[PDB]
Design a protein around this nucleic acid. Sequence first.
DNA 1: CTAGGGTCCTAGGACCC
DNA 2: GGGTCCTAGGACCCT
Length: 342
Amino acid sequence: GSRKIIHVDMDCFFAAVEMRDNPALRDIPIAIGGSRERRGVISTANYPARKFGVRSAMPTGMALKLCPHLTLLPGRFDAYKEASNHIREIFSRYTSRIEPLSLDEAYLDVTDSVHCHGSATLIAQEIRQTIFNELQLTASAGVAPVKFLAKIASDMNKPNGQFVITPAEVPAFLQTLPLAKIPGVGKVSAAKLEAMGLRTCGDVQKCDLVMLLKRFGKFGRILWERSQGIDERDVNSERLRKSVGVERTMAEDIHHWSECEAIIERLYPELERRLAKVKPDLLIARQGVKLKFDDFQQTTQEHVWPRLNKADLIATARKTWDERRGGRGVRLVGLHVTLLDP
DNA sequence: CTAGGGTCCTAGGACCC
DNA sequence: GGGTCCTAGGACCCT
Ligand SMILES: [Mg+2]
Ligand SMILES: [Mg+2]
């Protein structure tokens, strides 16, 4: 009863797309991200920039101190979405069991596939080659018996490579695997785990489930399971979006309600346009707002509401502005909608 | 020197039984 | 006191 799971992942996705479309950017350091004047961060960088230490989520000021010649690009999201739709259609030629996790990556369940003599390794290789043909973008892949190992594997022969983990290899792989490599174990969790002497899956294997449950709740069960190769999550091809959000960080903190109100007047049309692509009648479950202060605390207040309404969002923001700001400056304003359930 | 797009989990009181 | 809704906050994911 062993499944075959592929995780396909595009290499330097946004940057790879800008390089294809402009060959002049191929061996100079580039990154998609907001300027230092806009208080931005790096979305991603190409390998010539990564050589300097440039990483996704790095503050752009830090990026430029490591890499003074970094060329900064704003991003063409329609071009990324187009490449995303194309690779998902390529995925569909092999199976319908496709769970996309973002623009540039998907799980594929090829257990019941008849392609490539049932070889998941050859399927992943054909997919990567087909993506390179047709799109001139490279992809890496991971092959494993469960989702999370397949996703760890797609990183290990990046870029333009793949890695296969058979059931026989699972125990040696896990023994030395850092817990931080499991998707969903982030910096806070890894630091708590490290401070009790837990660094690898091998360490967690020597742990009692009951202790993990008390110390981390349902997360402790996940930790215990994953540390043993256990991951029964099914590839799910019918997930649907649940929310729509539009927010902006200002170049300077704002201190007057008039400034906050002006920002909302520009955010609202964008929220309406994006909601309308998926809900023409603008009917929704909740709507709300978000402020982030200069002490980097953030607050949201949202409520049941039947249909996108600009004035109520202004009204709510006013109340949040008056009631939870406490004299701090504001660096971000956001609008938010929760979608109806079906 | 700290984005913008999201998902999922937790937790207290309201409400219902 | 157990479900379930409402709401707020936070860790985490992707580029
Ligand atoms: Mg990628
Ligand atoms: Mg990815």
